[PDB]
Design a protein around this ligand. Structure first.
Ligand SMILES: *[C@@H]1O[C@H](CO)[C@@H](O)[C@H](O)[C@H]1NC(C)=O
Lengths: 49, 68
């Protein structure tokens, strides 16, 4: 490719990244991000730590 | 017709004979040049109205490298 800056679109360079997820088998790994809040004190509450 | 009275050197176009052959010389042939300088049309309006003519019929826009 002889790329030049004065080239119509469709002739200018594009960078490409191809992500390919390939499963297999395991006991655990990456996953979503859990949410949280601001714990309190001196109040019957329903909590998860 | 004599060859030296036709409007140019070779008689290729007769377009310079219009002032002698005009049918009705008391009617101005329509000329919109004063209405362009009364609305402050720049250099860019003449092509942007031209691009709106072609997109009106179903043809693509200019390529956006066309403008710089
Ligand atoms: C052409 O360009 C105009 C703005 O310059 C845009 O509104 C219009 O959608 C374009 N035409 C097409 C087919 O996308």
């Amino acid at each position: 490719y002889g790329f030049q800056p004065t080239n119509g679109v469709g002739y200018q360079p594009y960078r490409v990244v191809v992500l390919s997820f390939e499963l297999l088998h395991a006991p655990a790994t990456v996953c979503g991000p859990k949410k949280s809040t601001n714990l309190v004190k001196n109040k019957c509450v329903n909590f998860n730590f | 017709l004599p060859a030296h009275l036709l409007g140019d050197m070779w008689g290729r176009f007769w377009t310079n004979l219009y002032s002698l052959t005009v049918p009705f010389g008391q009617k101005p042939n329509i000329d919109v040049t004063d209405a362009m300088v009364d609305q402050a049309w720049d250099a860019q309006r003449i092509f942007k109205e031209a691009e709106k003519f072609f997109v009106s019929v179903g043809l693509p826009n200019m390529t956006q490298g066309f403008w710089e």
